């Protein structure tokens, strides 16, 4: 199971990401530079973006949402209920399991399979040294590149200032010498269509990375440490994530913000094998980008398979006019 | 004297001198590693003459032929044409080679690359016969990498060229014995390479600074008798 | 150069004796490209006018000094032939450092 | 004229032990002396006799000696003793190569005999060397006793450097002054006064100690001995030691220019010296981000780190006077 | 068989190949000092640089997996299974494949044949000697002088903070002093458009390197040792391998960034004989430069097959439009 | 073309004090002109207030209020007429609504 997507997502409202602490005043959030064209050279403008840690904790969030429900959610770490990422930070040689049961790092395969995070969303051990990367990895949410061009340069930036009511139990407002925070404080709030892009290698979960196979009958079978049930639940949990993904939880500040989520359009490809990875949203050419390439790796004698939301793409080549996200997953999860 | 001029536009340089840790790196390409470039190429253009049972042999020998054609054991020179910079670097060269330190022992280290945009070379020859000349020209070109195999190398042309005893300065390099009767620079360059000798080379680079940064421009040193110009600038090249 | 009439103005916003704190004017005014956001973002810093005189007005300290209108031309008289960015970020980006620095306002 | 040359090994170490000739003269006279830049030699014009170099040498490395008794098989926390050599081993072995001068040079006889170099007089020495199919048993690298003598006193008297422990680690940040088109004795005698003993800083509020090209920005700025690279051309080769966990290693080795940064000191301490030198601190403890920033325009010259600067500064504790900033205004031009 | 290929990529919003900053709080990006005209002026400019290791280790981490999948892959070692890759060194004599069979280092060609990694990325037997050179080369990455010319000066570098937040059992957090770890590190993102250039010399790979030929029979045929199956088998993944290059599979941080990446343009030429490596992308007129190569490589008596992506180079050169990177590996894989 | 300050003058009436005419909403629209046609609603929202000004002056002791000549209103329309792109539409409106706040001697 490897499966990549890419699609603009029209955003407007969002304070998703800020720098500035809550203490400091005027919360600002995060920019980045980009480069485009604008029938020139190539010119460099800051905009606000999302970071891919963003998006990473919020898939893990959303990971362990979907996967508690099912028969084997015993098997996810501590930790994990909390939704801290933390996974065996620096310091530490044991862990606790989400049943109070302690795991000791010692070999992958045990690590990968009492525990299901540390296995999908990959986890370091400082104290022993073992490794595992990532199966999901996100890029950024940054506006595309005709939409900048068109937009001049508008600074897509809202600076809403307010304030709480906080006043004495006497009901008058006092001062700072008298213990109360009567402060105005600046949240940013952004606005633009946005790309963004997201590869999943689920075909390797429950498979430890030292030993990824194990030729008991000389034949490449897979070192599936876990029951291959407990797989097929993991990897359909993971495909479900993606539905709370393109909905409006993928940002902080959801109390107060709610980002204000539209799915313009999108192309999903998937072949249970390996495949390169797309070409972001971020670039105004990347509907021919990805049909050349798509096309191309199936005439290679790849069983790519391809869903559309939203694109004409080639219209000669097999694609499936998906409606709606979860939908885009059920297919998934159909052929897993 | 034929002479082997080639234009050769690589952007990085990576042979380090004689130091450990932090690996200096020469501000010139030094004759052995064009030695042993034009001995691969060798290798791979006509192979029926050099086989051998290891690469070692192999390259030795080809550089022992070469060495043969050549002139003298002082070698080729080279002329850097744009400034000259040191530009330190930092890559996981692992420290395993050794006694014991287990097999995996990876450890940041210092490797500086110099930035060139443009050189030339020109090789020194004793009037070599013509039906090695198209041979060791098609040689003289595709070397596709020189130092180590990250630092890419590319040739645009490659031609032959007389001296006719043309008067101009030596901006070229020339080993430190005939110039004492001639802003200078020399040091040890390992003209020689060792397969298991240091001879002081002149270097033709100024540290000057115009306004803020110093890079390495023009020496304009002493006229000499033997030169030879391409493209109408003269260059001044030295010869046993 | 009819600099520090203007860098005291957009020093008054940032000052801790002035509690607004409003940043996106001097970052506006700092990051501008080219001539219309810069313009905006200038426009933007001077139309906290009223809420700096008679907020400082009623504190007591002697009230913020308006940027007078003879040099208010001279800004656009120059900005018009500042068509390199390049050559505009020499004031841009003093017009917001000026606003961080001392500027002792009113004890 | 004696024109005495210089061994040509190591243009760092080939710098220190030539760039300490000149202090070995003072202490003798030589007088109308100057350093011509070999491009690696760095050869030395002097006026001085054979015997003549003797006896002022012996005057230059007696004071090192003399300042090891001051603390104590005696380890001192001096430069070279403890102060810039990482390594346990060379606390003992540099005082005893210096004594053992004495006993050689007072009594009017030559060295006869080869030391091992720590890495501090070379980054480009270590432990080890790829000769052809592995490496060479033993420190291959040798200098003979008198250049090593000479290239300690040079490092001791003028090369300035930094030495942060922050607990169990340590981070030796060690500092080298090059000519590299011309010098007078007198400017070199300049840079002499730029060292200053034993700048053992640790501390934790000074946490900006590491990060080279941040933390010689704090030594610069109290530092006044003369405004003269603005009329000479000289670079700084710098490079740093870490003794984390007992590994000894060189981590950077980024060839900065020091010109530039002091042009800028100058230019902004021209206007006023109360606001300056607080500014700096002030900005350089609190907002170590901005520093950055900082530090970083003045070698790029671009106008945005300076405006980043400002602002973090302005965030935590920096005043951020107005005549400072008028400075900042005429290095934009 | 032979082919060199070197473009120009557009790729934003990376943290590739950073210092480590193991001992510091602070994780910078790798910089780079860069020599350019400024109209009669040799400025140095601050650009980051992706080092050729990165791309050397990735393009081994694609061919590793790409092996994998054809039936052929047991001849693999199995320390190139975990991403590794010292092969051996002075103290080792014995080599360990996936399935855990002893090779001897007697000679390069039993070497070759019963490991492919060894083939393509060389190896070194100091003990025994039988030095083989890697056969797939890549420069660095750099931003072309046009657009350091374009942007001249300015950061083109976002510095921005994440924290780790490690709270006690309810919710207690700590800085330094209560056994947790609490640390808001900084990294630096580039952007740009940077050029690329690679050799792919293939057509050594099962073949020894101290025979290039096997000449017995008075015709000089490649000495092949292994099977020709095979071998195109390990050319067809090598080649492949390729595919997750241009892609957005490089550097380090690919969880927390996975670059933003594009290709811009392009030029490749192939043939089986020895084949002249063309230009960096890095000058600016790296187009004419490949024109010129390859026009005089033409011109003696080279049987060059050129494939273009977005541009044009010249009309009288016969060069084959691409329309991806996957379109360049499928017309390559034909031989 | 001399015109933006004159314009600029009278608009300032609506913002200084000594007016007790705080109409911040036409300065407002003014100067977020996105389009020429509600940039000359602006305007004309601006000068519908005139009366008042000039009628209130004369109440307080203050000089009338100068009002732009005809030869201005001509100048302004000549400007829009020719100008369909917002690229200078922008810079236009911005150039005569930052002077409504100035330090003018309206009262001495």
């Given at each position: 199971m490897y499966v990549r997507i890419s699609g603009r997502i029209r955003l407007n409202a969002h304070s998703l990401n800020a720098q500035g602490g809550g203490g400091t005043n005027y919360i600002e959030i995060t920019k980045t530079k980009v480069t485009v064209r604008t029938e020139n050279g190539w010119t460099v403008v800051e905009v606000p973006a999302i970071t891919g840690n963003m998006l990473k904790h919020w898939h893990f969030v959303g990971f362990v949402d979907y996967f508690k429900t099912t028969p084997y959610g015993v098997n996810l770490t501590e930790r994990a209920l909390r939704y801290?990422?933390?996974?065996?930070?620096?310091?530490?040689?044991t862990a606790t399991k989400a049943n109070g049961a302690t795991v000791q790092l010692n070999d992958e395969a045990t690590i990968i399979k009492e525990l299901a995070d540390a296995d999908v969303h990959g986890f370091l051990a400082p104290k022993t040294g073992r490794r595992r990367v990532s199966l999901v990895k996100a890029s950024f949410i940054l506006p595309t590149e005709d939409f900048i061009k068109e937009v001049e340069?508008?600074?897509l930036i809202t600076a809403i200032k307010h304030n709480r009511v906080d006043v004495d139990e006497k009901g008058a407002i006092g001062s700072s010498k008298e213990g109360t925070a009567q402060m105005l404080f600046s949240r940013e709030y952004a606005t633009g269509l946005y790309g963004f892009s997201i590869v999943l290698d689920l075909g390797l979960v429950g498979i430890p990375q030292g030993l990824p196979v194990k030729f008991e009958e000389n034949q490449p079978r897979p070192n599936i440490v876990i029951d291959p049930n407990e797989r097929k639940a993991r990897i359909e949990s993971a495909l479900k994530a993606l539905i709370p993904m393109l909905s409006g939880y993928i940002g902080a500040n959801l109390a107060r913000s709610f980002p204000v989520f539209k799915v313009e359009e999108l192309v999903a490809i998937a072949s249970e094998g390996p495949i390169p990875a797309l070409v972001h949203g971020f670039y105004e050419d990347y509907i021919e980008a990805n049909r050349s390439i798509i096309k191309n790796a199936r005439a290679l004698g790849f069983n790519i398979e391809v869903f559309t939301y939203?694109?004409?793409?080639?219209?000669?080549?097999?694609?499936t006019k998906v409606s709606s996200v979860e939908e885009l997953v059920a297919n998934l999860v159909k052929m897993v | 004297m034929d002479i082997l001029l080639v234009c050769l536009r690589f952007p990085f340089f990576s042979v380090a001198k004689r130091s450990y840790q932090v690996r200096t790196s020469f501000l010139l390409p030094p004759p052995s590693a064009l030695k042993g470039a034009l001995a691969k190429g060798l290798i791979l253009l006509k192979p029926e003459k050099y086989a051998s049972s290891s690469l070692d042999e192999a390259a030795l020998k080809a550089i022992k032929e070469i060495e043969s054609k050549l002139?003298?054991?002082?070698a080729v020179s080279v002329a850097p044409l744009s400034p000259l910079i040191r530009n330190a670097f930092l890559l996981k060269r692992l420290r395993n080679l050794e006694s014991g330190s287990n097999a995996e022992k990876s450890d940041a280290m210092r490797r500086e690359y110099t930035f060139t945009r443009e050189l030339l070379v020109a090789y020194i020859f004793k009037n070599l016969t013509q039906e090695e000349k198209n041979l060791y020209l098609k040689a003289a070109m595709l070397i596709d990498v020189i130092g180590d195999t990250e630092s890419l190398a590319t040739p645009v042309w490659a031609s032959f060229v007389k001296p006719e005893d043309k008067k101009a300065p030596l901006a070229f390099s020339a080993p430190y014995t005939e110039i004492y009767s001639l802003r200078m620079y020399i040091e040890k360059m390992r003209v020689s390479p060792e397969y298991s000798q240091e001879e002081i080379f002149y270097l033709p680079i100024e540290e000057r600074r115009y306004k803020r940064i110093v890079y390495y421009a023009r020496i304009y040193p002493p006229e000499v008798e033997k030169a030879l110009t391409v493209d109408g600038e003269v260059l001044g090249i030295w010869i046993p | 150069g009819w600099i520090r009439n203007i860098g005291r103005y957009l020093s008054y916003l940032v000052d801790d004796t002035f509690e607004e704190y409003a940043y996106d004017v001097v970052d506006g005014i700092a990051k501008a490209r080219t001539q219309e956001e810069l313009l905006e973002g200038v426009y933007k810093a001077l139309r906290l006018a009223p809420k700096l005189k008679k907020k400082a007005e009623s504190k007591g300290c002697p009230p913020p000094r308006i940027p007078s209108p003879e040099d208010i031309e001279a800004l656009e008289e120059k900005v018009e032939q500042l068509s390199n960015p390049k050559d505009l970020r020499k004031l841009a980006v003093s017009l917001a450092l000026w606003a961080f620095a001392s500027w002792n306002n009113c004890p | 004229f004696n024109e005495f040359k210089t061994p040509q090994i190591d243009p760092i170490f080939d710098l220190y032990v030539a760039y300490g000739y000149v202090v070995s003269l003072i202490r003798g006279g030589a007088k109308e002396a100057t350093l011509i830049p070999h491009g690696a030699s760095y050869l030395i014009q002097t006026d001085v006799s054979n015997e003549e170099f003797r006896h002022g040498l012996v005057d230059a490395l007696s004071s090192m000696l003399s300042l090891h008794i001051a603390l104590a098989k005696l380890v001192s926390d001096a430069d070279f003793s403890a102060g810039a050599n990482i390594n346990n081993v060379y606390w003992d072995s540099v005082p005893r190569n210096l004594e053992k001068l004495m006993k050689d040079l007072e009594k009017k006889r030559s060295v006869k005999g080869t030391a091992t170099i720590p890495i501090?007089?070379?980054?480009?020495?270590?432990?080890?060397?790829?000769?052809?199919?592995g490496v060479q048993g033993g420190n291959p690298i040798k200098v003979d006793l008198l250049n090593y003598a000479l290239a300690w006193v040079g490092f001791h008297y003028y090369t300035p450097y930094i030495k942060y422990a922050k607990g169990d680690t340590t981070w030796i940040h060690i500092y080298q002054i090059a000519p590299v088109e011309e010098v007078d004795m007198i400017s070199i005698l300049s840079l002499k006064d730029l060292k200053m003993h034993?700048?053992?800083?640790?501390?934790?509020?000074?946490?900006?100690?590491?990060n080279r090209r941040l933390a010689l920005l704090y030594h610069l700025l109290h530092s006044e001995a003369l405004e003269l690279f603005t009329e000479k051309e000289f670079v700084i080769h710098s490079y740093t030691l870490e003794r984390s966990g007992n590994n000894q290693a060189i981590r950077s080795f980024e060839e900065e220019e020091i010109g530039k940064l002091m042009d800028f000191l100058w230019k902004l301490k021209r206007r006023d010296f109360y606001h300056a030198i607080k500014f700096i601190d002030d900005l350089l403890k609190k907002a170590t981000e901005g520093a950055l920033a900082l530090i970083d325009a003045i070698m790029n010259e671009r106008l945005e780190g300076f405006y980043t600067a400002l602002k973090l500064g302005k965030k935590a504790g920096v005043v951020s006077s107005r005549e400072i900033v008028a400075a900042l205004e005429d290095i934009i031009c």
């Amino acid at each position: 199971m490897y499966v990549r997507i890419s699609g603009r997502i029209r955003l407007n409202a969002h304070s998703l990401n800020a720098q500035g602490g809550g203490g400091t005043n005027y919360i600002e959030i995060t920019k980045t530079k980009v480069t485009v064209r604008t029938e020139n050279g190539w010119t460099v403008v800051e905009v606000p973006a999302i970071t891919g840690n963003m998006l990473k904790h919020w898939h893990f969030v959303g990971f362990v949402d979907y996967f508690k429900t099912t028969p084997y959610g015993v098997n996810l770490t501590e930790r994990a209920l909390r939704y801290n990422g933390t996974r065996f930070g620096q310091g530490e040689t044991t862990a606790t399991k989400a049943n109070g049961a302690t795991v000791q790092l010692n070999d992958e395969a045990t690590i990968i399979k009492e525990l299901a995070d540390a296995d999908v969303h990959g986890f370091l051990a400082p104290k022993t040294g073992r490794r595992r990367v990532s199966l999901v990895k996100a890029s950024f949410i940054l506006p595309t590149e005709d939409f900048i061009k068109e937009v001049e340069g508008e600074r897509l930036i809202t600076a809403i200032k307010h304030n709480r009511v906080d006043v004495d139990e006497k009901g008058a407002i006092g001062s700072s010498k008298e213990g109360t925070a009567q402060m105005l404080f600046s949240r940013e709030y952004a606005t633009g269509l946005y790309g963004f892009s997201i590869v999943l290698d689920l075909g390797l979960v429950g498979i430890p990375q030292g030993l990824p196979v194990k030729f008991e009958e000389n034949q490449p079978r897979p070192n599936i440490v876990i029951d291959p049930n407990e797989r097929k639940a993991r990897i359909e949990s993971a495909l479900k994530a993606l539905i709370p993904m393109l909905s409006g939880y993928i940002g902080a500040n959801l109390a107060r913000s709610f980002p204000v989520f539209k799915v313009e359009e999108l192309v999903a490809i998937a072949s249970e094998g390996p495949i390169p990875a797309l070409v972001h949203g971020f670039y105004e050419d990347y509907i021919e980008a990805n049909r050349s390439i798509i096309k191309n790796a199936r005439a290679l004698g790849f069983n790519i398979e391809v869903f559309t939301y939203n694109v004409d793409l080639g219209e000669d080549i097999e694609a499936t006019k998906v409606s709606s996200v979860e939908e885009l997953v059920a297919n998934l999860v159909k052929m897993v | 004297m034929d002479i082997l001029l080639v234009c050769l536009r690589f952007p990085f340089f990576s042979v380090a001198k004689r130091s450990y840790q932090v690996r200096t790196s020469f501000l010139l390409p030094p004759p052995s590693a064009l030695k042993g470039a034009l001995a691969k190429g060798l290798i791979l253009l006509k192979p029926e003459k050099y086989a051998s049972s290891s690469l070692d042999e192999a390259a030795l020998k080809a550089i022992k032929e070469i060495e043969s054609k050549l002139v003298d054991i002082k070698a080729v020179s080279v002329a850097p044409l744009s400034p000259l910079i040191r530009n330190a670097f930092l890559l996981k060269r692992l420290r395993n080679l050794e006694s014991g330190s287990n097999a995996e022992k990876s450890d940041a280290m210092r490797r500086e690359y110099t930035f060139t945009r443009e050189l030339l070379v020109a090789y020194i020859f004793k009037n070599l016969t013509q039906e090695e000349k198209n041979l060791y020209l098609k040689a003289a070109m595709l070397i596709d990498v020189i130092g180590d195999t990250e630092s890419l190398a590319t040739p645009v042309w490659a031609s032959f060229v007389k001296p006719e005893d043309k008067k101009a300065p030596l901006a070229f390099s020339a080993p430190y014995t005939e110039i004492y009767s001639l802003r200078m620079y020399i040091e040890k360059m390992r003209v020689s390479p060792e397969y298991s000798q240091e001879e002081i080379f002149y270097l033709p680079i100024e540290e000057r600074r115009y306004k803020r940064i110093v890079y390495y421009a023009r020496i304009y040193p002493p006229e000499v008798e033997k030169a030879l110009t391409v493209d109408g600038e003269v260059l001044g090249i030295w010869i046993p | 150069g009819w600099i520090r009439n203007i860098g005291r103005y957009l020093s008054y916003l940032v000052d801790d004796t002035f509690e607004e704190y409003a940043y996106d004017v001097v970052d506006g005014i700092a990051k501008a490209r080219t001539q219309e956001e810069l313009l905006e973002g200038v426009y933007k810093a001077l139309r906290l006018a009223p809420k700096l005189k008679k907020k400082a007005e009623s504190k007591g300290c002697p009230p913020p000094r308006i940027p007078s209108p003879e040099d208010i031309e001279a800004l656009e008289e120059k900005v018009e032939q500042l068509s390199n960015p390049k050559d505009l970020r020499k004031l841009a980006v003093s017009l917001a450092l000026w606003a961080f620095a001392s500027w002792n306002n009113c004890p | 004229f004696n024109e005495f040359k210089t061994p040509q090994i190591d243009p760092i170490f080939d710098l220190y032990v030539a760039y300490g000739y000149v202090v070995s003269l003072i202490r003798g006279g030589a007088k109308e002396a100057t350093l011509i830049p070999h491009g690696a030699s760095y050869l030395i014009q002097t006026d001085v006799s054979n015997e003549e170099f003797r006896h002022g040498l012996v005057d230059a490395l007696s004071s090192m000696l003399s300042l090891h008794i001051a603390l104590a098989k005696l380890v001192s926390d001096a430069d070279f003793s403890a102060g810039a050599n990482i390594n346990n081993v060379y606390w003992d072995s540099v005082p005893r190569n210096l004594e053992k001068l004495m006993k050689d040079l007072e009594k009017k006889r030559s060295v006869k005999g080869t030391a091992t170099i720590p890495i501090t007089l070379m980054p480009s020495a270590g432990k080890y060397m790829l000769k052809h199919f592995g490496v060479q048993g033993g420190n291959p690298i040798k200098v003979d006793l008198l250049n090593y003598a000479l290239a300690w006193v040079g490092f001791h008297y003028y090369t300035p450097y930094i030495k942060y422990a922050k607990g169990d680690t340590t981070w030796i940040h060690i500092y080298q002054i090059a000519p590299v088109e011309e010098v007078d004795m007198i400017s070199i005698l300049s840079l002499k006064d730029l060292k200053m003993h034993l700048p053992h800083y640790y501390e934790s509020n000074l946490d900006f100690l590491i990060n080279r090209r941040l933390a010689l920005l704090y030594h610069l700025l109290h530092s006044e001995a003369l405004e003269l690279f603005t009329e000479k051309e000289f670079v700084i080769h710098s490079y740093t030691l870490e003794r984390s966990g007992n590994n000894q290693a060189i981590r950077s080795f980024e060839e900065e220019e020091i010109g530039k940064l002091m042009d800028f000191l100058w230019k902004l301490k021209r206007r006023d010296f109360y606001h300056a030198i607080k500014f700096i601190d002030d900005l350089l403890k609190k907002a170590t981000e901005g520093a950055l920033a900082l530090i970083d325009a003045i070698m790029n010259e671009r106008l945005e780190g300076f405006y980043t600067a400002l602002k973090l500064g302005k965030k935590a504790g920096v005043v951020s006077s107005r005549e400072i900033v008028a400075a900042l205004e005429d290095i934009i031009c």
